[PDB]
Design a protein around this ligand. Structure first.
Ligand SMILES: [K+]
Ligand SMILES: [K+]
Ligand SMILES: [Mg+2]
Ligand SMILES: [Mg+2]
Ligand SMILES: [Mg+2]
Ligand SMILES: [Mg+2]
Length: 114
RNA sequence: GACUGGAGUGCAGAAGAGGAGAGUGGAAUUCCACGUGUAGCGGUGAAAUGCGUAGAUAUGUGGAGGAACACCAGUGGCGAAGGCGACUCUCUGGUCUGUAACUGACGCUGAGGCGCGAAAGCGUGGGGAGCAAACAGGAUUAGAUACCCUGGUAGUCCACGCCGUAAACGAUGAGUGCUAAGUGUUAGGGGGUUUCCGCCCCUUAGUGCUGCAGCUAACGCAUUAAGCACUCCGCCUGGGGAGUACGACCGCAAGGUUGAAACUCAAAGGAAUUGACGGGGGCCCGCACAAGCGGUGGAGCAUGUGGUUUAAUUCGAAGCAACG
């Protein structure tokens, strides 16, 4: 009711933004597809902003003033999404990383055009 | 017979992902269960196949399973090479530095043999999370038995045993000595100075950069020589056929090692130079685009050209650069 955590999964294809409680129960989420986009336009900072805003202004169901934000992936829309979450009318307390880095564990798939 | 600069042992130190075994750690991919949780996720140049209201995607908790080990990590270390990176222990190999104690040429190479030997692959039995040949579906395309997407078996991992190939490459055989420098870097030693620290110089074995002589067809090599010399081995004698055929040996097999001729060609090739080109880069320009104006292509006619039909339909011009 007072504070939440935001998880953004930004990738070179789409941006998901989920607002949850600090001990990890979902209240809301959104993405560019639920926002109404269909192609590469999903992958844009504008879609990132819009999905962020929809997420936060539904998170004001049970209400909050403060967010801790956690950013995942190489998607370029993290700046726009964080600006959205600051400017929607919430006090983003801190930003942090969820870069899922293995210490050379399981290997990636192949490069493209090979 | 004698000696020690080679070679080796001893003695005092130093580094190290050198190898085998056993055990061990946490990231992190996947999966199982459970909450929260609502309609998308994924992917592309666009998509679609596919997963998803029988509830995902995500988010947290806990658990299972295997594979590889970020930072350190560096033209840095070690190793004969292949290659070796998480940690600890055990068992082991080799290298360098200093000494001049010890032996006293005991050495260098090395046909034929013996072993090792990336990855793929083969046999048996496990394991199999990811990635993934083959394959299926979806796109692409003129077609696509491909690139591209979603899935995915062999495999990849282990034990044991085979296979013994490689752009297995520094495309540069092992050994010895000699022939200018400058500079990093690693492991050591010696000395001058200084409170150690720190700076400096000399030297040993490595590893890299740049360069003198000299060599080289040149590119370039240059005390880590492709220099100057000696020993030993292996290999070459135009291209292709052909690393084929016969033969032998090895191999469960796949296939490997050894290795020709007939026939055919008049070249094949290396390095470098000048251009031209480039679905390479960079800089600059032109109505070249873009921004705009008005037009052609549509209609009718004039003209020219083509094709044709003609006794003849004179000849010439033919992408830009022929066709009022
Ligand atoms: K096997
Ligand atoms: K190699
Ligand atoms: Mg193998
Ligand atoms: Mg224009
Ligand atoms: Mg007209
Ligand atoms: Mg004419």
């Amino acid at each position: 009711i007072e504070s939440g955590i935001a998880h953004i999964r930004s990738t070179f294809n789409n941006t998901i933004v989920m607002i949850t409680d600090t001990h990890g129960n979902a209240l809301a989420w959104s993405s560019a597809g639920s926002l109404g986009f269909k192609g590469s336009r999903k992958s844009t900072p504008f879609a990132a902003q819009m999905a962020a805003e929809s997420a936060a202004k539904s998170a004001q169901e049970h209400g909050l003033k403060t967010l801790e934000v956690t950013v995942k992936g190489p998607g370029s829309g993290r700046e726009a999404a964080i600006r959205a979450l600051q400017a929607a009318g919430l006090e983003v307390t801190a930003i942090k990383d969820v870069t899922p880095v293995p210490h050379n564990g399981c290997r990636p798939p192949k490069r493209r055009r090979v």
